[PDB]
Amino acid sequence: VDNQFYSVEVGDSTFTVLKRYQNLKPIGSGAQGIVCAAYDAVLDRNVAIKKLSRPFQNQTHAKRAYRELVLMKCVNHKNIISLLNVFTPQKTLEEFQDVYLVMELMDANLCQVIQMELDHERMSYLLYQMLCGIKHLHSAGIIHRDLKPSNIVVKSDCTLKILDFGLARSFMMTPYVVTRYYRAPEVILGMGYKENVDIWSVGCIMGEMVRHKILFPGRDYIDQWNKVIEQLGTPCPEFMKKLQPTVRNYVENRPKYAGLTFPKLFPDSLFPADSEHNKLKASQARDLLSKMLVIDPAKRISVDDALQHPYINVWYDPAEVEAPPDEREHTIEEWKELIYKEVMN
Numbered sequence: 001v002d003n004q005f006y007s008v009e010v011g012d013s014t015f016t017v018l019k020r021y022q023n024l025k026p027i028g029s030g031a032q033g034i035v036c037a038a039y040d041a042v043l044d045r046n047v048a049i050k051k052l053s054r055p056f057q058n059q060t061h062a063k064r065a066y067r068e069l070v071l072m073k074c075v076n077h078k079n080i081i082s083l084l085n086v087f088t089p090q091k092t093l094e095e096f097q098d099v100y101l102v103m104e105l106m107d108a109n110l111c112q113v114i115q116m117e118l119d120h121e122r123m124s125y126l127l128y129q130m131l132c133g134i135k136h137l138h139s140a141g142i143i144h145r146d147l148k149p150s151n152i153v154v155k156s157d158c159t160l161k162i163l164d165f166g167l168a169r170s171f172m173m174t175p176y177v178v179t180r181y182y183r184a185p186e187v188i189l190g191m192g193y194k195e196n197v198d199i200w201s202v203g204c205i206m207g208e209m210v211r212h213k214i215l216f217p218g219r220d221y222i223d224q225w226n227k228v229i230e231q232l233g234t235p236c237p238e239f240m241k242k243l244q245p246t247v248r249n250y251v252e253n254r255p256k257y258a259g260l261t262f263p264k265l266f267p268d269s270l271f272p273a274d275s276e277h278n279k280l281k282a283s284q285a286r287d288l289l290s291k292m293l294v295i296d297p298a299k300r301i302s303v304d305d306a307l308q309h310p311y312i313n314v315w316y317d318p319a320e321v322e323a324p325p326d327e328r329e330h331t332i333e334e335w336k337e338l339i340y341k342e343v344m345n
């Protein structure tokens with residue numbers, strides 16, 4: 001069984017992969033583990049391989065691994081990364097350590113794209129695909145709540161896929177920091193959420209594509225909340241009453257702001273605005289931003305309305321926007337077997 005597999009060093013990590021997977025090259029990593037590009041000799045094409053090291057290590061890694069494994073196996077949409085293969089090189093439950101996820105190989109994450117000037121055609125198309133993916137997750141009862149540029153990937157042909165399935169419905173001993181900058185006020189302030197929680201994150205990413213700077217940076221949620229109100233202004237009263245009384249006291253009592261206008265937030269400097277085409281697309285991009293970056297989710301644009309926005313709808317395909325389509329608590333030994341049984345079936 002192990003002669004189905006070979007071992008290569010990739011940084012500090014050892015990848016033990018099926019012999020079909022040749023010429024591994026690191027392309028990224030995070031808390032879950034290391035990601036490599038490989039040639040798949042059987043499919044005759046490049047793939048991405050993510051190694052999860054002992055995902056049953058702790059509740060958080062285990063919940064995420066199990067959830068991600070179940071969801072990318074059963075979810076099928078051009079804007080959600082497809083799982084091509086799943087394996088472990090260990091032969092039994094007792095020996096089981098590592099899960100390798102094999103995906104279609106994309107070229108880059110959105111962090112690299114944010115560093116570029118994109119025309120309106122590419123920006124609107126990327127945003128359209130993000131919205132089609134979110135739509136599809138929402139239609140399957142998945143509200144991500146954790147979209148960020150590092151887990152959205154793109155090809156050279158401007159095709160986009162979401163890598164991950166977001167938060168569950170979490171103490172960890174790592175160096176690894178959670179990126180919070182794209183999290184909605186509903187998540188920052190823990191105040192219940194609907195589908196358009198994910199619109200906030202799209203607005204943060206779009207904002208960043210235009211500014212080339214994180215909109216709402218902060219050491220913690222305190223700083224991040226300051227950065228939100230400093231720019232969009234203190235929200236309205238009906239917003240507050242939706243908050244836990246402890247959070248409510250906190251928000252109700254911060255130094256007030258009227259905030260900045262969308263023209264000052266995203267000046268004409270930041271958009272292609274030479275041609276009449278680009279002038280009109282700049283005003284439409286700023287409009288859509290003004291509707292996504294809305295603190296109060298009652299007043300924030302929905303996924304469906306965002307897809308109908310003039311900046312986006314030039315791409316709109318019913319095939320892509322319409323297609324039909326866990327949370328428990330175990331010990332590390334139970335998670336190991338649940339994950340093992342999913343990897344084997």
Ligand SMILES: Nc1ncnc2c1ncn2[C@@H]1O[C@H](COP(=O)(O)OP(=O)(O)NP(=O)(O)O)[C@@H](O)[C@H]1O
Pocket residue numbers: 027028029030031032033035048050081103104105106107108109149150151153163164
């Ligand atoms: N299928 C893939 N194709 C191309 N690059 C990928 C692929 N999967 C991951 N990457 C790259 O590897 C980086 C890290 O992968 P990622 O899966 O985000 O690990 P993570 O951020 O630790 N876990 P998670 O955020 O929950 O998905 C991503 O930002 C991409 O740059």
Ligand SMILES: [Mg+2]
Pocket residue numbers: 030150151163164
């Ligand atoms: Mg990620």
